[PDB]
Amino acid sequence: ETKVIYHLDEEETPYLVKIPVPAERITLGDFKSVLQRPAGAKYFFKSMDQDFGVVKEEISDDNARLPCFNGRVVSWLV
Amino acid sequence: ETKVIYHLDEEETPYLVKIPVPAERITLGDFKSVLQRPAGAKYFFKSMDQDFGVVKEEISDDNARLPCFNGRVVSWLV
Amino acid sequence: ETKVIYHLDEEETPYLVKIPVPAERITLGDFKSVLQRPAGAKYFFKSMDQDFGVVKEEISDDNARLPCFNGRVVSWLV
Amino acid sequence: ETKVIYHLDEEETPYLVKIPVPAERITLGDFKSVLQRPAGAKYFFKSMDQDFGVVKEEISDDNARLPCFNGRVVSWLV
Amino acid sequence: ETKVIYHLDEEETPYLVKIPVPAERITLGDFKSVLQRPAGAKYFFKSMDQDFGVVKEEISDDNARLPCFNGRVVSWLV
Amino acid sequence: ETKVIYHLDEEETPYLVKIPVPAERITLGDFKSVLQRPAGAKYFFKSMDQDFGVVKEEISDDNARLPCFNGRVVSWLV
Amino acid sequence: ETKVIYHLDEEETPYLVKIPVPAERITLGDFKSVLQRPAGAKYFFKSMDQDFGVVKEEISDDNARLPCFNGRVVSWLV
Amino acid sequence: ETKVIYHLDEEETPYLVKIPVPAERITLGDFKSVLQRPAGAKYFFKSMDQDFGVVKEEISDDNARLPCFNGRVVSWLV
Amino acid sequence: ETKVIYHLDEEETPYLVKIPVPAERITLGDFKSVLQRPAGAKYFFKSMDQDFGVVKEEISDDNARLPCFNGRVVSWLV
Amino acid sequence: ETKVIYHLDEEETPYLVKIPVPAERITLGDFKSVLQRPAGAKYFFKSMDQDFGVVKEEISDDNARLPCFNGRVVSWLV
Amino acid sequence: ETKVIYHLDEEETPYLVKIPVPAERITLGDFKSVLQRPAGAKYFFKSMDQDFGVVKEEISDDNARLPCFNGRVVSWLV
Amino acid sequence: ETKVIYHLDEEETPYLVKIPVPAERITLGDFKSVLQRPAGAKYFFKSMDQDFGVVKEEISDDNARLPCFNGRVVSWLV
């Protein structure tokens, strides 16, 4: 069970979704299906870059795994 | 007796439902039955996260316990 | 005499009913009888919550008193 | 002479009947006589409330005066 | 002492300021002196009109009085 | 002094503006100079048509007079 | 000991200050003496109004007490 | 595969986009298409100048290559 | 060994200091002894408030313990 | 092609703009158009003075040529 | 051979020092012996933290190794 | 012939010394044989780093070459 916490563009408080798969094969398409967003949103994900530190990488490929930032998938929308 | 408070997407004022069960076994399906919403709504629930603080976690499993935030179930819809 | 003002779902102008009982024993069933609504409506009532402010609490128990919001029972339907 | 305008439930155009009494002692039962409605209708009357503005108060007592909203009794039925 | 409550444009929770004058002769310039708005703001005030009910009237003259809507000056900004 | 009541697109409560000219020569551009709208708005004014009853007519000429409705300029925006 | 949580203008995460006096006699100037703000700031405080619910009331008198909203002095700056 | 780390004007954390082309033919229009920016933004790019050192050169031509600063396209927006 | 990461006023990248005491009994005065700040600075520390989430609480007593936010003392200066 | 390097007031890293005109007719107005600055800024330019060495001369005339300091237009803003 | 680039307090251009030992066992006291600073300075070294990204960590033990951030020991003084 | 422009600690006017060897094999000890500095001074030389831009690298080996920054050996003392 992964608690994928995400945000949106203007709302100040973050959200959370319980995702039924563990944190070794969780992809973008599993997180995208349980949100029911109307159009194509920008799915940023908080990852650790070896050159710049914390980065919010946009993922648009549904086969790409989610970056488990300290075992807690922090995401963003729009 | 639990006084669950829920909002909606666009309306500015919160709601309230008196729920006859106490605050140790209240689930989503008890709250979902007394609302009589037409379609599948996004049932967010204000919960305290150990990493980010106040989060609004979406609950879809009807067996899940509601996260009573300081003894006051704050909720959100749509 | 209590002037319980109520609204409906889509109509922008509010209604009003003169109710012959005073504001210490007025319940849901006294207000529900003089309206002659065809089916089960959502009887919201504007109340003052000490944690979130103004709330529109749904009352479905006919023994429950109506929340006298500053001596003026503001209500909602559907 | 009072030109009481009244509406009905579904039809969009308003009617207009004449009541021979002036606008200080016109009652509900005087207005109820010239309408020849078959059953008990909901006689709403457009009145000015000091807390919410324009309200449509249902009058069911035949001794109650009609609210002269700017000298023009706007009414509603059903 | 007047509890003149004012809103802003996008902020949903309202403010409150105290004025040292009573409610009988409170002007806009007394309310304009405890705010210090950075630009020329639109000072709407909740008033009761005899033809339309609750209106939010714009007051621009600093010597003009404020409408005590039920003994509570409700205002709006921008 | 004219009380030009104007509504907006989605807001339910109407506004009010005191205008320093009388009702005999009040124009749209005089009413437009006191609102300072951010873009070109649709200024629908409540008028009385002799074939269809009450109408909300668009006025775009800034020197065009405003149709009073029983001595009260009712307007609409957007 | 009181936990007087306060926000700032643009900063989204809130602050916290322990104040050595209890909640029964805590004043603004006691809270003002522990921040040492570089200019005259606007000290809004979350209070409960009996007509509008939660309000952020501005307090400027240094001897005026602070509204203990549910035993927690929430505040705002600028 | 190139990981184009970029920033914006006010946000403190950098972003990242995975770009499916390698680092010998990547242009500005390839990076501009996957961002879906609303208007014409200032596309600065971190480059090594032999006279002044690290510079952030604005690129507006879509045929121009991106400066591979140590094999990592660091960029800026607005 | 504690890694007390701390920020400054305008500098966006954070610092880090090692403290020879463990995290269970670390005080402000031990953290204040490895900095040698030129004046009295504001020592905000990231803590978890049970009513508002993450807060930056100011600690001024040198014998007061530091809030181990997820086993990591995050701090701020001035 | 001229690669004009410019700085700003507080940012430590220099910028760069490619300019499609050569270094014999480049003026201030050609450089000012491609920057899209909001207000009137101080456009300093590095030039070699015969009495004081390197100087940053302010140019405000759009007909004035840019001083090609060793074939490299070094500039400054604000 | 290591290129230990370091900065100072007010000087914006960075320095560089060739150190005769490799990057596997380079310590602070080896780097401290080649500068001969006139007083005890703060040796902030750019390191990669797994919870916040890039950090400027302070090293005070002369036998403590230096964090080779991407094979380049970036440092700071005072 | 080389024009090795160099500075001192507090003097803002740079010096210039001629060295009878060309730029291809100019060493520090050849530059050290022209100045005759009264003590062991720090010989920083303006070089181009491929990760940080312009740097002032300290050279202490007398047989080590000097970095020809754009064909002009800019140096520093103490």
In chain E, the domains with their CATH numbers are 1-78 (2.40.240.130)
d(CA B9, CA B78): 5
3-state SS of chain E?
CEEEEECCCCCCCCEEEEECCCCCCCEHHHHHCCCCCCCCCCEEEEEEECCCEEEEEECCCCCCECCCECCECEEEEC
| Residues, chain H | 78
Do K5 and K74 meet the contact criterion of CB atoms below 8 Å apart?
Answer: yes
Any CB–CB contact under 8 A between H34 and chain L?
A: no
Q: Three-state DSSP class for A78?
A: coil
The CA-based dihedral angle spanning residues F45, F49, F54, F57, taken in that order and rounded to the nearest 10 degrees: -20
3-state secondary structure of B58: strand
Q: Nearest CB to J14: which of H42, H55, H61?
A: H55
Q: Which residue in I14, I18, I34 is closest to K52 by CB distance? A: I14
Which residue in the set E5, E17, E18 is minimally distant from G52, CB to CB? E5
Helix (H) or strand (E) segment spanning residue B45: strand B44-49
List C-alpha distances in Å: I49 to A74, C65, I46, I72. Answer: 21, 37, 10, 16
Cα separation of J48 and J66, whole Å? 12
* CA-based radius of gyration for chain B: 12
Mutation choice for I interface testing from G16, G37, G46, G76 by most I CBs within 10 A: G16
Nearest CA among K63, K68, K47, K76 for reference residue K1: K68
| Residues in chain L after which the chain is broken, C→N over 2.5 Å | none
H chain contacts of residue L52, beta-carbon cutoff 8 Å: 53-54
Nearest to I3 by CA among I77, I68, I76: I68
Neighbour-count burial of I75, counting CB atoms closer than 10 A to its CB (0-12 exposed, 13-18 middle, 19+ buried): buried
Give the position of tokens 């060739």: K18
Q: Give me the count of residues in chain B.
A: 78
| Angle value at C-alpha B11, between B8 and B14, nearest 5 degrees | 65
Task: Supply the DSSP symbol for L32.
Answer: H
Residue H14 sits at the chain A interface (C-beta within 8 Å): yes
* Tokens coding I59: 């600690």
DSSP 8-state secondary structure symbol assigned to residue B61? -
Selected for mutation to probe chain C from G46, G49, G54, G72 (highest C CB count within 10 Å) is: G54
Measured CA to CA, the distance from residue D45 to residue D49 in angstroms comes to 12
Asked whether G51 and C70 are in contact (CB, 8 A), the reply is yes
Q: φ and ψ at G31, to 5 degrees?
A: -75, -30
- Which residues from C are below 8 Å from D58, CB to CB? 15-18, 34
Contacts of B18 (CB under 8 A, 6+ apart): B1, B2, B3, C57, C58, C59, C61, C64
Smallest Cα–Cα separation from A46: which of A74, A14, A71?
A: A74
Amino acid at I10: E
Instruction: Report the amino acid identity of residue F57.
Output: E
Question: Nearest Cα to E4, choosing from E37, E55, E46?
Answer: E46
Q: Residue holding tokens 């809130």? A: G14
Which helix or strand (DSSP H or E) is residue H29 part of?
Answer: helix H28-33
Distance of CA J74 to the CA centre of its chain: 6
Give the strand pairing for D2-6 and A2-4: unpaired
CA L11 to chain CA mean position, Å = 16
Phi-psi region of B53 (alpha: psi -120 to 50; beta: other; left: phi over 0): left
**Dihedral (CA of C33, C34, C39, C43) sign:** negative
Question: Which residues, listed in sequence order, are joined to residue I57 by a DSSP beta bridge?
Answer: G16, I45
Reading phi first (left if > 0) and then psi (alpha if -120 to 50, else beta), residue K9 is in alpha
Going J31 to J37 to J41 to J47, the CA torsion angle's sign is negative
Judge whether H45 and H74 are in contact, CB under 8 Å. Answer: yes
User: Looking up tokens 């491609």, which residue turns up?
Assistant: J34
Q: In the complex, which subunits touch F with 3 or more CB pairs below 8 angstroms?
A: E
Task: Find out whether E50 and D46 touch, Cβ atoms under 8 Å.
Answer: no
Considering all CA atoms of chain K, what is the largest pairwise distance in Å, rounded to the nearest integer? Answer: 35
Tokens of K60: 């005070």
**3-state secondary structure (DSSP) of residue K14:** coil
Per the CB < 8 A criterion, the answer to whether A22 and A55 are in contact is no
User: Are G5 and I44 inside 8 Å of each other by CB?
Assistant: no
CA D36 to centroid of chain Cα atoms: 14
Residue B71 contacts I where some CB pair is shorter than 8 Å: no
The alpha-carbon radius of gyration of chain F (Å, integer) is 12
CA F37 to chain centre: 13
User: Coil, helix or strand for I31?
Assistant: helix
Write down which chains contact chain D via at least 3 CB pairs under 8 A: C, E
Residue G34 to residues G30, H31, I58: CA-CA distances in angstroms?
Answer: 7, 50, 10
Of all residues in chain A, the one with the smallest CA distance to B54 is A13
Chain D residue with CA closest to E47: the answer is: D53
CA-based nearest residue to K69, from K1, K8, K2 = K2
Phi, psi for K47 (deg, rounded to 5): -125, 170
Mutation target to probe the B interface, by most B beta carbons within 10 A, among I48, I55, I57, I72 is I48
State the resolution, in angstroms: 3.6
C-alpha–C-alpha distance, residues J71 and J3, integer Å: 9
Please state, in angstroms and rounded to a whole number, the distance separating the CA atoms of residues I65 and J70. Answer: 60
Q: Which amino acid is at D60?
A: S
CA atoms of A17 and A31, how far apart (whole Å): 8
* Matching residue, tokens 């969780």: A26
Residue showing tokens 């396209």 = H73
d(C-alpha D24, C-alpha D30), whole Å: 13
In Å, how far is H55's CA from the nearest CA of chain A?
A: 17
Distance CA E60, CA A18 (A): 53
Do L74 and L59 touch, CB atoms closer than 8 A? no
Closest CA to G6 of G25, G29, G38, G32: G32
Q: Which residues pair with K53 in a beta bridge?
A: K49
Half-sphere exposure of I12 (CA within 13 A, CB side): 9
CA distance L73 to L46: 7
φ and ψ of K70, to 5 deg: 55, 40
Considering only the beta carbons, identify the residue of A49, A60, A61 that sits closest to H5. Answer: A49
Rounded Cα gap, residues K35 and L61, in angstroms: 15
CA dihedral F26, F28, F31, F36 (to 10 degrees): -160
DSSP codes, J6-70: E--SS-SS-EEEEESS-TTS-BHHHHHHTT--SS---EEEEEEETTTEEEEEE---TTSBP--BT
**Cβ distance D40 to D73 under 8 Å?**
no
**What does the alpha-carbon distance between residue J5 and residue J9 come to, in Å, rounded to a whole number?**
14
D54/E50 CB distance under 8 A: no
- Say which residue the tokens 């007593």 belong to: I61
What does the buried/exposed string (b/e) look like for G51-66 if buried means 16 or more CB atoms within 10 Å of the residue's CB?
ebbbbbbbbeeeeebb
Report helix, strand or coil for A33: helix
Return the CA Rg of chain K.
Answer: 12
| The token pair that represents B43 in the structure block | 């049932």
- State the Cα–Cα distance between residues C32 and A36, nearest whole angstrom: 39
- CA-CA distance, L14 to L3, in Å (whole number)? 12
Interatomic CA distance for residues K63 and K25, integer angstroms:
10
Query: What's the rounded Cα separation, in Å, for the pair B70 and B5?
Result: 13
DSSP states of C29-71 as a string?
HHHHHTT--SS----EEEEEETTTEEEEEE---TTSBP--STT
Nearest Cβ partner for E15 among G51, G55, G60 = G55
- H/E segment holding residue D17: strand D15-19
D36-D40-D45 Cα angle (round to 5): 85
Nearest Cα residue to F4 out of E51, D33, H53: E51
Q: Edge-to-edge strand order for the sheet containing F43-49?
A: F5-6, F74-77, F43-49, F53-58
* Cα separation, K52 vs K38, whole angstroms: 33
Inter-chain touch A16–B49, beta carbons under 8 Å? yes
Q: Does G71 touch chain C (CB under 8 A)?
A: no
Q: Is A64 on the interface with B (CB under 8 A)?
A: no
A17 exposed, middle or buried (CB, 10 Å; 0-12, 13-18, 19+)? Answer: buried
